Structure formats: C-alpha cells, structure tokens
Amino acid sequence: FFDLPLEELKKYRPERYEEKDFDEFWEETLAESEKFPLDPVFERMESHLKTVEAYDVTFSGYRGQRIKGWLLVPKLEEEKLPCVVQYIGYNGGRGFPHDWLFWPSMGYICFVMDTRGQGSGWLKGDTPDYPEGPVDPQYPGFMTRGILDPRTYYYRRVFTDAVRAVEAAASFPQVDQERIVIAGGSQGGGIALAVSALSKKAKALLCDVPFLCHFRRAVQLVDTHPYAEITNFLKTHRDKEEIVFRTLSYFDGVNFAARAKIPALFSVGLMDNICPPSTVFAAYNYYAGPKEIRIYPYNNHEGGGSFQAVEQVKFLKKLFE
Amino acid sequence: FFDLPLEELKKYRPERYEEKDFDEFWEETLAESEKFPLDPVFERMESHLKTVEAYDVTFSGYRGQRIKGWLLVPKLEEEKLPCVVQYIGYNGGRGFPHDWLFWPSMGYICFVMDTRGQGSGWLKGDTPDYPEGPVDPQYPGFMTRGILDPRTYYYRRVFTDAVRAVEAAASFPQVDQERIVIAGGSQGGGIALAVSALSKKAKALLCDVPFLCHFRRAVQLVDTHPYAEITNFLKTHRDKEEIVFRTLSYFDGVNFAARAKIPALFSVGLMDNICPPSTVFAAYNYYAGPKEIRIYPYNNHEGGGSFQAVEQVKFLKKLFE
Amino acid sequence: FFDLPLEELKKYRPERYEEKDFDEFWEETLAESEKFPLDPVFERMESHLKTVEAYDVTFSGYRGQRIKGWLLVPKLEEEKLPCVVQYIGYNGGRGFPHDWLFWPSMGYICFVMDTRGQGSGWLKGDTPDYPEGPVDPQYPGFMTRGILDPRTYYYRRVFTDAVRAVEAAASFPQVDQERIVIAGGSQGGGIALAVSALSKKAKALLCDVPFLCHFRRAVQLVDTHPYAEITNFLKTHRDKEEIVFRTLSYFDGVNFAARAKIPALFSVGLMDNICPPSTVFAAYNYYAGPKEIRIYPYNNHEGGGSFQAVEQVKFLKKLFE
Amino acid sequence: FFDLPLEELKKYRPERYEEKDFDEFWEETLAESEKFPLDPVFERMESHLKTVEAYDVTFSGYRGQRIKGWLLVPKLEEEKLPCVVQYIGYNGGRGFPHDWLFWPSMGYICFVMDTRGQGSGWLKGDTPDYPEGPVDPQYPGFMTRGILDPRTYYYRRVFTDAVRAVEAAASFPQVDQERIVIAGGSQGGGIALAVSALSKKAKALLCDVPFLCHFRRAVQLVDTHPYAEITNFLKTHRDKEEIVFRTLSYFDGVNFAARAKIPALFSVGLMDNICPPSTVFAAYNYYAGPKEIRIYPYNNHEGGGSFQAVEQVKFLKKLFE
Amino acid sequence: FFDLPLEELKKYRPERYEEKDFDEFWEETLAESEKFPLDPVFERMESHLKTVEAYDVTFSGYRGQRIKGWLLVPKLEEEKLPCVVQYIGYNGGRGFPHDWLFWPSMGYICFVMDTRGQGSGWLKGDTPDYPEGPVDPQYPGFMTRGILDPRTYYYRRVFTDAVRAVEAAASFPQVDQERIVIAGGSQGGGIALAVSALSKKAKALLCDVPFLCHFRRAVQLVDTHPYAEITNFLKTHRDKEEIVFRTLSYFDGVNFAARAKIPALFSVGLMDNICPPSTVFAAYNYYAGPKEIRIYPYNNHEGGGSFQAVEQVKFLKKLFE
Amino acid sequence: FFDLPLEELKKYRPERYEEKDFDEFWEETLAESEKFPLDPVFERMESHLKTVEAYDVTFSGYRGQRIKGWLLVPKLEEEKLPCVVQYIGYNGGRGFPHDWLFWPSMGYICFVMDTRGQGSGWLKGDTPDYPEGPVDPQYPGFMTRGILDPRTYYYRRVFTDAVRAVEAAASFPQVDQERIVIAGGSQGGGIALAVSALSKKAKALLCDVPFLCHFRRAVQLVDTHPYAEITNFLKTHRDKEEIVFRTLSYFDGVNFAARAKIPALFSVGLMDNICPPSTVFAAYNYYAGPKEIRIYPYNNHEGGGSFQAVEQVKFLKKLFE
Ligand SMILES: [Ca+2]
Ligand SMILES: [Ca+2]
Ligand SMILES: [Ca+2]
Ligand SMILES: [Ca+2]
Ligand SMILES: [Ca+2]
Ligand SMILES: [Ca+2]
Ligand SMILES: [Ca+2]
Ligand SMILES: [Ca+2]
C-alpha cells in the first residue's frame, strides 16, 4: 500500500488542468482525419482455428495512414453479434489471431487494433508509425515521442486510429451496432478512455488498470516504466517542464473521463506501481457516465486477472438485456 | 547465454543415474492406484461460453484421491474429436474454464488437470494434496515435500494423477482415443514427460521448456526458483545430499525420456534461467521416440510463446494425417 | 523509518477484530489435545558438551502427535533451577544441542521446542507436521497451510504443541516451577505470546521482534517474507479475503496479548521490515500483564541482539528476587 | 572478469560477417548525401566563457538534414590550430558549450556533433531525427529503429552526419587540416570508428570503450543496455533474426576497423559489461592502421577516465611532431 | 517524491540541536591550527594545458598538517582575477589539473582542495589523514571515523583544512580578495557551508545538493551511502546513540548555516535520495545571509547539472557588479 | 557453482608470488614487537554467567599497542585445560563474553581476540588501531588501509596482534600449552593461517571459509565485499596496481600456508562468493602440515555451520588423544 488510503482514493478529485482549446484540438484532429476514406478491408485468412473465423484488417486511422488489426468472428448462427474493440498494452501489438480468443468464445465479435510503431516488447506488431516530419530529441520509448507539441505527440495519432477502429468494426455486416464495446487494460485502457469521449459509436467501456492518467501525479509517485520515460526526459530537459505537461494535458484520461457518457466498468489494483491507484481513481471519479469499479486490494498491475474477465462478461450481459 | 554453447547442447548426453528398481517402483505405484476405481465424473456447467461446452471434472488419481479438472468441448459437427491433456505450471491450478480456450478453438477437446496442493501463485486451484501420514521437515514449496523417500515424495502423487487423467480423458464419449495428446510447459512439461513413459493411452507429447529434468545439474547452474528450493534444503540438511538425489532420480524427466516411445515436439529457450537449456537438451537427447525441438536462442523462460503454439498445431495436424 | 513515528507507536491501539467464539475455539483445542497423555520422555545423550547435560526430548503436542526437543541442564549444585522454554524462528528447527548454550550458561535449564514441519531454512529440524486430512491449495510455506479454516490452520497445531511443551518442561524433576519462562523471537515471539495467554504454567514472557501480530496491517505495510505468503495467496484467491482474515484472527498475537497476565519483556526494531514496529506495538500496547519494551531505533529485524540478551538476564534476575 | 582471458582477447579475431555490397552501400549513401550542399554555418555566441570563443554550428548531414553542434576555439596566438571532432555517447547530445572544455584547454579547436533524435538521457540535445517515411515497429530506443533494412536504419543517418561533420570542421579557417582528430567513447567510439573508414579528411582516431561492435557476440554476452534493446526486439520478432543481423553487419565497427588506415589510440575496460572487452578487442585486432590500446583491467565502462585523457594528449602530441 | 512536499519543505525549520560550547569549540580549533604557519607553496607544473597555468599547491591545514591542491590560473590580461575555492565530493580527491577546467574557462582562478585520506572512490587524491592518536572502532569510511568525541572526529580536521585553504588562495598575488567564492556539491557543499560560517575571507557561497546536514533526519529517511555509515555504526554500538549525535551536532551544516552571513546560491534535487531535500532545505531555511535556491523537481543527486553551472556564473557576475 | 569444478579445485596449485624478503619482513616485524613486554592482564568480571568464569583481557600486540579480549574458563575439575584462540570476522569485535560460549561448553578455555579498529558492523569492539603516522588515501574499510607499503599495511598490525595473542593465552596458568588451538572463519581464518606460520606456540589450526587468500584471483572472480574494496581502489588508482599486489603478497594466506606445519582442519563452501572456493583451495593445497578439508557443495559463505562445529570438536579430540 504505497498510495492514498482507500477511503481517500474514493473521494480523490484533484483539480483538473487542461488548455481552453482542448475540445477544438480534438475536433480539428478528427475532422482532418475524416477527410480520408476509412476504406476498411476484411480479408478472410487461412487458419487452423475451427470455432472462429479470422480476418486480416486494414483501415485508415490518423491522416489516412493504414493500420492493421484482426477480426475474430465466432461461428454462431445469430445474424448480428455484439462486438468488443480491443486495444493493446504498452510494447504489444496484434500478435496472432489465436492470442485474442476470449471474447469470441463468449459470443462477441472481436476487433483487435494493432498499435503503430510498437509491437516489439511482449507481442509482435505489424503497423508502423508515420511522424509529422522531424522526430525531435526523445527518451527511448513512445511516451516522449513528439512531446514538445500536442500536434506532433505520438498519442494524437494512436487515439485517432482508435476512434477510427470503432468505425471500422461498425462497418462489418455481422456487427450489432447497438452492442459495440471498447476495451483495454493499461495503455489499452487509456486508449479506450480517450475513445469513450471522442467516439460516437461506442456503447460501453471496459477500462482496466488504466495508463495515461493524471501524468503529473504518476511521475512524482512511481519510478517504474513507462511513466519513468517522462521523468527521465524532464531530468535532462530541465527548461521543458511546463511545455511537457501542457502537451500531456491533451491526452490525459482524467480530462477525457470528465467528457465520457457511456456506461463503464473499471478495475484497479491497490498495490499497482505501474498505474498507481490514485491516477486510476482520479479518472474513475471524474468519469461522467454510469460507472462501476472493481477494487483488488492485494493485486499489483495484474489487477483482477481472470476474475475481472468474469466480471466483465456479467456486466455486459446485464447492461445489454 | 549462461549455459553450454548450442553445438555442445546438441550433443549433451550426460551419464544417467537411476536406481536398479526404477521400473519396479513405477509398476507398483501404478498398480496400487489402479485398485481404486477411476470413477470419472463430468458435469456440464452453466457458463457464458458460447463456442465451447464446459464440464467440471473429478477423477481418482493417486490412491483413490479425488482430483479436479476442466473439460472443454468445442461445438463442432464431428462426432469424435482429438484431445489435449493439459498439465499446469508451478504454483498454478485449473483456474476458470475460459483460461484454456486455445485447444478447443483449434478443434480439440481439452482436459485440464488441476495440480494437487498448489493453485495459489498465479492461477487458482481447487485440489488438495493428501500426504502419506507425516509431512517431514521441508523448505517452503513442493520440491522438497517428502523428498527423503521416493514413496512419500510429492511428485509420485502428481505423476500418478497425471497418468490417471489420460484414462479419464479417454473415458469421455466424444474423445477420439487414437488422437490423445499430452501437453505441458515448465512443471507441466516435466509431468507430461513422466506420462509419456508411464501411460499406454497417450499418442503424442508437447513438451515446452521442461522442468523436473537433470536435477543435479539444475541445482548447480541456477539460483532461481523453483530449483533453489532443493539447494536451500541441502544448505541446511548437509547430511542428506545422497538421499535427496537418490529420491529425485525416480522423478527425473531424463530417465523417463529414455523410456518414452511416442512422437514429441519439444521447445527450449537458450536464455532460460528457470529451466536451463542443458537440462532440457539432456531430456530431449535421451528421448527415445520420434522427436523434434524448436530452439529459441534469445528467449528466457517464455520460450517460443505464441510462435510455438503455431508450431504445435502444425505438428499435430501433420502427425495425425 | 518506514512506519508510524515513535510517539504514535506508543499510543497505537488499533480496533481489535476477533470472532465471538475465540475463547471457546482455544478451550476446545486444548481440551481435545489433553485427552492424549503428555508422555514426556527425556533421554540423556552422548555429547562432547562438558558444562551442560543434554537430553533428547519427546512429548505429545497437538492431538497426541509426538514433538521433538532438547533439554540442556547446566552442571550446577542447585537442586531446583529456573527454566527457559525456547521457541524457534521461521524455517528453523531444534538443530543441535550446542546451538542453545546461552540460557544454560546463565544457570537456566533450557527446553528447546522443535517446530513441526519446518527445520529446513537456517537450522535443521526433526519433527513432522500431521495435517487434518486434506492439505488444501496453498502458497509455498507455512503461513497459508490450512488457512481456509481455523480448525485446519497450521498454527493451531504449533500453538498447541507450544502449550504442551511448558507442561513437559515442568515435568522435569530439577525444574523450579515458580521460575518457568517462555521465550522467543520473530515466529518464536508469536508462539510465546499465544502461550502467555493459553498456558497456566508460564511465569514470565520474553518476546522479541514478534511475528504473527496484526496480520491485516502487516500485509499492507511490507512485501517481505514470511508475511508476503499471505498477500501472494490473496492475489490469487481473490474470493477468499474475508475467510483468510477470519481464520488469522484466531492466531493473532494482539488478541492473545489482550488476555495475557504474566510479566513480559518485549523488544522492537524501528527499522524492522520483517516484523514492522506497528504490529509489535499493537501487541505490546494490548498486553494485559506487567510489561516493559526495549526499543532499538536504528535496528532492523536483528533487534537488540546481544544487548537485548543482557537486558533479558537482568530482567529475570530482578523479577524472580 | 566475465569475458575471455586477456591472453585470448589479444588474439581474438572472430570470423567477420558482411554482405558483398558493404562498400557500395556506403559509397551510394555518401554520394547521395554529397548532392546537397554542406552549407556549414558558424555563429559566434554570447557566453561567459573567457578563454574560449564558442560558436553555434549547423551543417547538412544525411540527405541535407540540418545537424547542430558547438565549435570551441581556444584564444591562442597560433593562426592554425589542431582540431578534435567529438562524437557523443548514447542518450546524450551537445549540451552547453562549457560541457566540452577539455580539448580547447589543451590548445585544440573542438567540434562537438549533436546526435540526431537523442539528447534526453544524460545531456540535452537540439537535433531531430528525420526518418525514411514509415517508422517500423521497434523496441524503445535507437538500436532497433529501422533495423529491418539497412537503408532505413537509424545509424546510417548518424554515420553520414558524422562523416559530414569532419567536412564542416575542416571548413573553419583557423583549423589545421593536417591535424584533424576524430574522437569518441561508447556510442561516440563506434561512430568515430565508422568515420575512420569513410572519411578522407580524418588524420587520427581516439576510440574509447567502443559500442556498435561485434553485435552477435555483444547480445549473447551481456543483458545490459543499450545492446539489450536488440535482444528484446529478437525475443518478440522471432522470425526476424537473420534480417536483424544482416542489417547490423553494415554498421559493425569490426567491419569498418578492417578498412581504416589512420593512426588510432583505443581503450578498453576488462570489467566493462556495457561494451564487453571481446567486442572492443575484435574491432581493435582488425583495425588496419597503426594502433595502440590502453588496457584497464579493473575498470568497468568508465574505462581509463582522466588517466586515459592524459594518454590521448601525449599520443597526439607525439603523432603530430 | 519520497520527502516532504515542496510547500512544506519551503517552511521546514526543525528545532536545532547544538551544545552550548559550539562556538568555543570552533574558536579553539581554529586558534590552535593558526599557531602553525600557513606556509602556502605554489609550484608551476609542466602541463599540456595551453589556456591555463597549473600550480601544485601545499598549505598547512589542521594542526600544521600539509594538504595538497591545484591552482588553475586562466591566461588573461587582467592583473587581479576572481577566485573559486573548490571542495570535493565524498571519496574524491584533487585528481589532475584538467579535471577542474570550468571556472578557469569562465575567467576565475580556481583553488582545488584535496580531501585528506579519501581520493580512492571516483577521483584519485594525494593527501593523507593524520589522526589524533588512536583510531577507534569504526564502520568502513569517513563518517564514523573518531565519531565518539568531536575533538577526534574526521570532519574537524577537514573543516579546518577548508578554512585554511581560503587563506592560501588569498595569498596568491593575482587573486582579487574582494571576489573569493567558496564552492562545493554534496560533501563539498557541506564543507563549504562550514567555511561560510568560520572563514573571514570568503565573499560568496555556492552550495549544491549539500551533504553533512540534519544528520538525525538524514539517517531515518534514507538507507543510501554515505549517511548509512552512521546508521550501521549505531546498529552495532547500541549504547552510543546520544554520544554519536552530540558529536555530529558540531559538524552539522544547519548549525553553520544559522551563523553564515555571506550571499549564497543553493541547489536541491527533490528526488535526491543521497542528500534528501528536507536536510538541504533545513540548512537553506536557517541560512542567515542573502540567499537563493534553484529547485530541480525531477532530479536525483545529479541536481541541476550543467544548468546549475550556468546559474552559478550568472549569479556571481550579478553579485560582483 | 561459479568457480572451478571440484576435480580442478582439488588439483589447483597456482604459481605463488612473493618477494625475496618475505621471511625477513616477518622476522623483523615480530622481533620489533617482542622488544615491548607482553604485559598480559586478566581481570575477572562480574557476570551473570554461571558455568564459565569470564576475564577481561589486555595484552601488547603490534609495537606495544594494547589489545582487548575475553577469556572464558569453563568451571571444571581438570587443573589444565585445552585452549582455543579465536579470531573474528570482518567488521566484528569481541562483543560480550556470552557471544563465545561454544568452546567453553566443550571444555576448552577460549581466548577471544578483539580486532583493532573494527567492531562496528555486526558485533561491537573496543580496540582502536594506531597507524604508522600518515593514514594515506584509501577506499572505505580495512583492506586498502596503508596498502601502498607493507610496513604501513593494516594487516601487518593485525597479524602481529594475533601472534602475540597466542603468547597471552599461553601465559594463563590453567591453559595446557600442549593443546593450544588457533581458530577462525573468514577474516578470522586468514588471520589464523598467518599465525599457523608465524607462531611457535600453536598446536592445531581450525580454518573455515578463509579470507585474505589468493588476492589477485579473488579480485578477478567476485565483486562482493570485502575483496571489492581492493578492486575499487584499483579502479581509481590506475597507476598503483603493481604496488598494491606487491604489498598484498606479504599478507596472502597461500604464502603462509606453504610454511605452516601444524595439523589443520579446513572448510569450504562451493557456492561461497565472499571467499571463493579457488582461493580457499589454493591455500589448502599449499598447506604444508597434516591437513583435512570439509567440503560443503551447496553452501555459500555460511559454510558448514553447526555441522562444521561438530567436525571440529571430533577432529581435536582425536588429534590430542
Ligand atoms: Ca474550448
Ligand atoms: Ca529394474
Ligand atoms: Ca466467547
Ligand atoms: Ca532418543
Ligand atoms: Ca563490394
Ligand atoms: Ca557558547
Ligand atoms: Ca610539487
Ligand atoms: Ca628470504
């Protein structure tokens, strides 16, 4: 228990910081990227999978840039199926279709979005990043890539891909558009939280142990990666502190949470030192839609694991009845 | 690269040590346990799973003792299906049925055997151990539980459970008995390797990054857990070295490997410091059936991960054609 | 200094939790074990020791189960001598007679109780555990052995052995029954604290850096072993939290302290991260007999070491004059 | 002493691996970059420095891309001065002019080249990287940036900048072109070693504890950063091993050493676990110009420190007399 | 952020502890050492340095004992120059003259004082210690050397050397005595802080990340070296606590700060775990002369690095105008 | 198993290095110290000990300097008793008389020699060091104290004290001079090994896990303390390597071993990374008296513990029969 006591966590509502043009920044970003056609492509694959049909996905994300994915369709006769749009944790990518069998096995179509430029830490990826011209001085990783301007920042492109990925999923004929879920843990949870505010097609949020939340507090509290990337950049670039935190304000899950309206199930680990409970609770507490949180007092960053997976299936069945 | 070079590993065939009553010990063990009825029990569960039917399993393992499991049957039109008997890694247990979706998704029935007394480290379990009367002084864990006599040793009970689990899988009416596979990684791999020699029903072996191999070498090469449990016991019980290694000889995967005849696919990580490459290659090199090994030079204990999963599905398809 | 400031520690009296049948549970436990004869056996042994006479001890502890020990009698004229009953720290056992020369050299008979099932970490042991039938799923070690029911819990058996060990000590003809001391550090301190409430024969308590106190706090404060065994179990068995802490309440030194009436000398290390100062002070502050505590501000789990040994000798001399 | 014995190091000449188009790859790379004007710009700065004149440098490196630097001119009578072109270690950048006062104080003009895209770990930098279009999946850092093709690889651009930096230094009027030295440690040593083979203007090499050498051995010997970036990439991209090491062959300091003809002073630490001794000695032993090595048996990556600085000034004074 | 919040650090003024004879102790110490002639010697050396003239220094410090140093004079027209007296961090020594080029390069004469008995950790030294007869039992290092009596304590001798060093600097003919600066970081900062109170010749203080401050707090806050030397001594010498802290009170930077009158620039790293922020702020807040502090929220013991060096040059320029 | 295989250890006989005046260095040292009277003082203490009489010891060691100790005399009928002269491990000191009850309890008078200047790490001490004038630059600790000249080296004083301590023990009236044993582990083992060659009064050697052996190999093999003190000094003082090892050659237990003639029991731990097996076996193999070694394959620096204590008591009983 390195963070605030649970009774304080449940009341933790730090003063939010954002620029006055937060909404217009996102409006412009999305409008610019919408000028290129989504052009979603689903290509049925040869696979040894027998209970699922697998597709190779390509769609246009940030500024027409082509993003990879998987679509896994369980072989069921229902003609319209509910759908989970799955975002991936830091240093991961889309891997193989058989890495994402949970949701299909529970009767949901699953759209797995590949993460631009990552895919080299714990699960392979196939999608590149394409920067806004010059790749400024940065600390190794994705957290400080373009951090000196919100227009050049890595997560502007990732979040835009992620909103577009729900439009791609929704284009698939067998997808029931009234039951589109956005889902992620860690980095995937911060991605999903941004999508919960920016997407018009999402109907429910699953947000586990979310990353990209309350950056200023995260960086003071823990020296774990990946938050430590920001701290390290700041240790060197000692003149750049105000600019760093200004840029990060546009991407902070606490500021998106305050704008989100769809129902959400969160999870938190009270001993999580990658995504500290205070940062997760700041985002939960500001979350503006109907919401629940499952709290795991003795867990680190693994959170609720398979127990939470049961919670999520039960939560969505009840929500959509 | 902390172990022997790969050219040497490929030739590594250390002198084997076993007592002259090795076979006799195992014949008596199995014969005594076969006097109790198997009494396999499959009970269909209420589940949110849609592509698979899930059953709660109970069967009689060592000396009539009741062992839990899961059976996952993918919903397919084929009347008899191939089957994978899945053994679980150290400190794990059967978990939830949804933790084992890989093989059913590939069209295989999957029998997951719960590990007596464990189930408390990384995945929950439901099966107790039942000792041979007194539970001797031991180091924390399962590696030194009953280690002063092979008749009282923890893994005598686990290995008997595991042989009996293949008989329980085979009793299921929808299982094709010409296509029963035994599978495991780490502790699971060492259990499987025992079964490959002691079972008459297994038709193929999948053996990844195997544990319980070449104990004398393991304990001198690495200070990682769980092999360190034996070293720590020996650090205290300085008079018991000969007895410890005598007992461990009856449970050594290298001595089972020498007697196994069924086809096998192994995997090894050359930077694996939990299951060192020399202990895995010692088992592989003595393995007496038709065999292949996939070698992952830059991987630690994670081995080939999802890449190896693809290898296994291809391996078994071609074997059974 | 990772815990509460000293001025707060001295006032620390957290709300106690126990079940309404705490006393009955212990009355029944002891009554059931008293139905078996103590049958204490003292066997003079061949030894190179010249200033002390050494005996091999056997006595009936929990449910008639036979527990080993040593009795060390200093060679002194005096026909009745004072006696220290010594309990041992985690992963230790009775070792050799010469491991326990301190009290005999100070003119006290010393009864060393071996710890069932341990004796494999830092000092050898010779006494097995005997479980209540099935040995449930557990994390490696003794802390979570049978933890799902106080009737099956490992320390129910250890505490009962420990109460019976005083009765065995008292049976020795040369032991002065008006000067029987119970003594331990760490796990030994926690055992001794339980005995201070449950024994009718004990006349003084020495309790150093006590373990098995204020479990709920211990497990939120430190990630060291052995308290980490409980946390790790809870990380996996996420449905079992209330049950684990209910069981643990029956074995909590804070709850025994509240009932103990004999004079006591405690010790505490303010930088102790094995047995945190708040857990020790919770026990000390509830302690209901005449009491003193020696506080070592700069020491970790070593506590006062040989300085505390001098304090204990002086304490007892004054108490018994 | 984790590496080969010193007697073996001094004879260590492993089989070199390079593609048949190594030389044409570099000829083409240089020729393409030479089609843009160098356009070197030296802009005198306001500084508190009194013994040195400082200039802000900009010059065109890889494909006309503008690279920053510093030029420090000591205030001396002599109309033409000798010059050190200084390359910077991993995660560093040009910092402030006062971070480079050693060589000016010894009477040498010093050209400090900023490292594109880094400058955020231990010293600030001001130069971006500019990729060849898509930024492929990569592990955090510079080592695997573009690694699937030598044409896209990060160090193609760094090495081309570094060759052009000598041309920029040479264009300064007070620089004696017969006494241009190239210098670096760690990453700067590997950059300088590439320049020793590719530049026509360099007259002497100072190469301390060099990085970017014998990649295949580095990655199997040590788990330190930055070599561990490559290993971590390979752990995930298990199908890309042959491509990774093919690409890296074009950038290996051993293959450049084999072509270099100018006099060199090397240094090595025999306990260096960042740049292991065998990788440094491979480069030194293949180095084809007149050469010396200072060996520091008890030093890690710090090498000879200020002792080696003394050696360098003595070595150059003698060389140029 | 392991220490008090910044808003609390800015007000942190703990109760000071010192003996009534604090001033008398220092008066006597200085008076006794002043009875030996300073006998400062400056010996021009052969050097490859071209912009600086380098001198070997010898002067009489504590009790006539002969202390080494360097004097670096920048080659400038000006007939009187300002001067920095530079103290060195823990385990350092005077090194080579070229290790100290910063201040000469900025137009200042630089007197580098070697630290008696150290010079063996990160930079070589040439000055021995000379104890007050018997060298008492101590923990490895300098922090507990003679710690049982302030007259025998290591830093009595160091602080006296350091006061005498300003008198030696001031005896150099080209030194402007109106512009003598005392400077240090870490141990150097603590030394400089003592000199700021004890010297009559110093005109400004540069005090970075100061060590030797608020010992009682330092020792309970962090387990890093060198403050851990004191804690380890106290762990053993459990009877010596009051004596240790009594001695240390005579050498505490907080107590000297309260007496210093000259202008000062401090720096602090809020993540500094060697010299914690609270101990540095305690000294800064009690500092009795005109003062400023540069605060580096994201830096550990490196502090402001080269950024702070720029601040120091600008601070002194403005001060001396 | 980090060191040479046991078959190689048993034959390991590295080329010895010593100066031609090794023997004369020691003859002169002893001769000089013998010019001061031994002046042994035994003062009986008030103690709570009942089976042992305890004396405060003072005797003249190196150059008449007064060294503390304890003498423990077991209360027995025999008029002359055998005696163990006990040397203490690194950072230890004589502690309290009750810290040394083992030998007395086995019927041996025990002379415990306090270690000059230490006594601050794990057990308190009371004896200061007295240096040969100036205390040269050193790394924290005792290993590099005076290391630039054998005349000034710390262990010259310690080894002289130790030879004198046997003479002081022999002066006690109840000591049987035909049964005087010299005993130590770690640093104590290295001290005892020197005394085995330099004393004429010692009749047997107990040498456990010896330190101060084969320095050049120790320093290459391990980075543990205390050998790392020498390495760290060498890392800084890069010009002083030949001098450091020349000095150490006069104090190397391998060189004393080659001259010792009395019967000896050694012990070694094959996983000992403080005192590596090769350094212990180098000393063992050159030992020129009748000898045995107890080998503990799975033990680190704890060696054989209480098992070895049993071996020692058996060894001596048989020797003296
Ligand atoms: Ca707005
Ligand atoms: Ca047989
Ligand atoms: Ca009751
Ligand atoms: Ca017996
Ligand atoms: Ca070619
Ligand atoms: Ca006064
Ligand atoms: Ca001189
Ligand atoms: Ca001679």
D window 280-299, beta carbon within 8 A of F: 296-299
- Interchain CB distance below 8 Å, F120 and E91: no
CB atoms within 10 A of CB C42: 19
A121 in B contact zone (CB under 8 Å): no
Query: Cα–Cα distance between F85 and F40 in angstroms, integer?
Result: 15
Chosen from C298, C308, C311 to mutate, greatest number of chain E CBs within 10 A: C298
* CA A179 to centroid of chain Cα atoms: 18
Is E186 annotated as belonging to a binding site? yes
Using the 8-state DSSP alphabet, how is residue B60 labeled? E
8 Å CB contact of C241 and A297: yes
Neighbours of B258 (CB within 10 A): 17
Give me the residues paired with residue A295 across strands.
Answer: A268
Residues of F in contact with E127 (CB under 8 A): 137
Q: Dihedral of the CA atoms D73, D77, D78, D84 (nearest 10)?
A: -20
Query: Among the options C33, C161, C272, C278, which is catalytic?
Result: C272
Annotated catalytic residue, options C186, C199, C267, C278? C186
Residue of C nearest to B143 (CA): C140
As a whole number of angstroms, the distance between CA F173 and CA C34 comes to 55
State the distance from the centre of ligand 8 to the C-alpha of F287, rounded, in angstroms: 19
Which residue of D238, D245, D278 is the best one to mutate when testing the B interface, meaning the one whose CB has the most B CBs within 10 A? Answer: D238
Resolution, angstroms, 1 dp: 2.4
Half-sphere exposure of D225 (CA within 13 A, CB side): 11
User: What is the identity of the amino acid at B179?
Assistant: R
Give the active site residue among F33, F186, F267, F278.
F186
DSSP run (H or E) holding F312 = helix F305-320
Q: Is D56 helix (H, G, I), strand (E, B) or coil?
A: strand
Residue C179, classed as helix, strand or coil, is: strand
Output DSSP code: residue D129.
Answer: B
Task: Quote the minimal CA–CA distance from E92 to chain F in Å.
Answer: 9
Name the token pair of C108: 């006290």
Residue of chain B minimizing CA distance to F294: B238
Measured between beta carbons, the chain E residues lying within 8 angstroms of D314 are 48
Q: Give residues with Cβ within 8 angstroms of E113, minimum separation 6.
A: E67, E69, E85, E86, E87, E88, E94, E161, E162, E165
How many whole angstroms separate alpha carbon A108 and alpha carbon D29? 51
Q: Does A239 touch chain E (CB under 8 A)?
A: yes
Residue pair F254/F283 in contact (Cβ under 8 Å)? The answer is yes
Q: Please give the method by which this entry was determined.
A: X-ray
Name which of D221, D235, D239 is nearest B298 (Cβ-Cβ): D235
Domains and CATH numbers, chain E: 1-321 (3.40.50.1820)
Contacts of B219 in chain F (CB under 8 A): 298
C/F Cβ contact: 3+ pairs below 8 Å: yes
Distance from CA of F6 to the nearest CA of D (A): 20
> What residue in E sits closest to C5 (Cα-Cα)?
E220
Is the CB of F130 less than 8 angstroms away from the CB of E127? no
Chains that touch E (3 or more CB pairs under 8 A): A, C, D, F
Nearest CA in chain D to E309: D98
Q: What is d(CA D173, CA E239) in angstroms, rounded to the nearest whole number?
A: 72
Residue C270 near residue C206 (C-beta atoms within 8 A): no
Between the two ends of chain E, the Cα-to-Cα distance in Å is 38
Nearest-by-Cβ selection for E123 from F91, F229, F236: F236
- Going by their DSSP bridges, the two strands B264-269 and B204-208 should be labelled as parallel
Q: At what angle do helices B22-34 and B154-171 cross, to 10 degrees?
A: 50
Closest ligand, as measured to the CA of B26: 2
Q: Give CA–CA dist B205/A257, Å, rounded.
A: 50
Q: How far apart are CA C244 and CA F135, in angstroms?
A: 60
In the sheet that holds B52-60, the strands lie side by side as: B41-44, B52-60, B66-74, B109-113, B81-86, B175-185, B204-208, B264-269, B291-296
Name the nearest CA neighbour of E170 among E270, E83, E264, E276.
Answer: E83
Which own/partner contact pairs does D75-81 have at CB distance under 8 Å and 24+ positions apart? D75/D51, D75/E51, D76/D107, D76/E50, D76/E51, D78/D107, D79/D174, D80/D174, D80/D175, D80/D176, D81/D107, D81/D108, D81/D109, D81/D174, D81/D175, D81/D176
CB D74 within 8 A of CB D47: no
Q: What sign results for the dihedral spanned by CA atoms B143, B145, B148, B152?
A: negative
Contacting residues for B276 by C-beta, under 8 A, at least 6 apart = B2, B3, B217, B218, B221, B222
Q: Report whether A26 contacts A37 (CB < 8 A).
A: no
| Cβ under 8 Å to D: B residues 1-30 | 1
D237 classed as catalytic: no
Would you call B91 and C138 a contact, using CB atoms and an 8 Å cutoff?
A: no
CB within 5 A of ion ligand 8: which residues? F 23
Query: Residue C109, SS3?
Result: strand
Query: If phi over 0 gives left and psi between -120 and 50 gives alpha, with beta otherwise, what is residue A154?
Result: alpha
Q: B238 vs F1: CB contact, 8 Å cut-off?
A: no
SS (H, E, C) A289-312: CCEEEEEECCCCCCCCHHHHHHHH
Nearest CA in chain E to C294: E238
Q: Both tokens of residue C207?
A: 């309790």
E239 contacts in chain C (CB < 8 Å):
307
| Contact residues on chain F for B241, CB-CB shorter than 8 A | 297-298
Strands C52-60 and C66-74: antiparallel
User: Residues of D numbered 131-150 whose beta carbons fall under 8 angstroms of chain F's beta carbons: which are they?
Assistant: none
- Tell me how far apart the alpha carbons of residues B296 and F320 are, in angstroms, rounded to a whole number: 61
Separation in Å, CA of E222 to nearest CA in chain C: 8
Is residue B194 classed as helix, strand or coil in its secondary structure? helix
CA distance linking residue D98 with residue E264, whole number of Å: 22
C199 is an annotated ligand-binding site residue: no
Q: What are phi and psi of D283, to 5 degrees?
A: -60, -50
C-beta separation of D270 from D245 below 8 A: no
What whole-number distance in Å separates Cα of residue F227 and Cα of residue F218? 7
The catalytic position among B171, B176, B225, B301 is B301
Q: Is beta strand E41-44 parallel, antiparallel or unpaired with respect to E52-60?
A: antiparallel
What letters, b where the CB count within 10 A reaches 16 and e where it falls short, cover C1-32? eebbeeeebeebeeeeebeeebeeebeebbee
For residue C56 the two structure tokens come to 């091999």
Q: Are D162 and D194 in contact (CB under 8 A)?
A: yes
DSSP-derived secondary structure for D219-261: HHH---TTTHHHHHHHHH-TT-HHHHHHHHHTT-HHHHHTT--
Q: Say whether F149 is catalytic.
A: no
Question: How near does any CA of chain A get to the CA of D219, in Å?
Answer: 16
Contact list in B for residue F299 (CB cut-off 8 A) is 235, 238
Residues with CB under 5 A from ligand 6 (ion): E 23
